[PDB]
Amino acid sequence: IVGGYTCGANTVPYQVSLNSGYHFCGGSLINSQWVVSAAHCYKSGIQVRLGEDNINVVEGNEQFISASKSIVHPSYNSNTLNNDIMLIKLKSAASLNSRVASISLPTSCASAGTQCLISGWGNTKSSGTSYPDVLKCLKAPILSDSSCKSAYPGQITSNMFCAGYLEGGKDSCQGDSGGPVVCSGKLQGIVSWGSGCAQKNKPGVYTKVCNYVSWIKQTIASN
Ligand SMILES: [Ca+2]
Numbered sequence: 001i002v003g004g005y006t007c008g009a010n011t012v013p014y015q016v017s018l019n020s021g022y023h024f025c026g027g028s029l030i031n032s033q034w035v036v037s038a039a040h041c042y043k044s045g046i047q048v049r050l051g052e053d054n055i056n057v058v059e060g061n062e063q064f065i066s067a068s069k070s071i072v073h074p075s076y077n078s079n080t081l082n083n084d085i086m087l088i089k090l091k092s093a094a095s096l097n098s099r100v101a102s103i104s105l106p107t108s109c110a111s112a113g114t115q116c117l118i119s120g121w122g123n124t125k126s127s128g129t130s131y132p133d134v135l136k137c138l139k140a141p142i143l144s145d146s147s148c149k150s151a152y153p154g155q156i157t158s159n160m161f162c163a164g165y166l167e168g169g170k171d172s173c174q175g176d177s178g179g180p181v182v183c184s185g186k187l188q189g190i191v192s193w194g195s196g197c198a199q200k201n202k203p204g205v206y207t208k209v210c211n212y213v214s215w216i217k218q219t220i221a222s223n
Helices: 145-151 209-221
Strands: 015-019 023-031 034-037 047-050 063-072 086-090 115-120 136-141 160-163 180-183 186-193 204-208
Touching: 015 034, 023 047, 023 186, 023 209, 034 186, 034 209, 086 209, 115 186, 145 160, 160 186, 186 209, 204 209
Parallel strands: none
Antiparallel strands: 015 023, 015 047, 023 034, 034 086, 047 063, 063 086, 115 136, 115 180, 160 204, 180 186, 186 204
């Protein structure tokens, strides 16, 4: 997260870290057996780490659980990043408590100007590299689709929205990939892509989760 703040330990209790020997992507817990993250975070051999704040120190509230199956969206296009969403089922159900909680799926899409919270353990510098050990948070608005498509001509589909700041300096970044964008208590977005991080006139692009609720609900029920 570039230009955000330290969240505070376990204040985003639905945030998941995907680990394959190291942290490489974020995710969101949507019920005790299922996680949603981005398709561009697919790997074989994922362990889902719940209850995390410092990902380098075991602090007492973590649950480490291996994925039993991963389902990448049937129409994910890795070149356009269109339909960038994947479901991960846990080998055993997480124990929900104050520090491990699920987030609700949206009943409708959010409008431009709604304020959201984005969170992740990804890169914190726009020019350079510095990876945090504790969860970073950023408050950011959904932007008009006009300013989203003018920043990226011909690349935005109906399954994508922009959120952030056109002046730059505040954005999600690699390492935040697959993580939550929550607006009004609902999971509205997944950290998907952008041009670098926190560059002027190049906002973050996010998977528009409200287009996918039927596929999510039908797939978790049959798996
Ligand atoms: Ca930890």
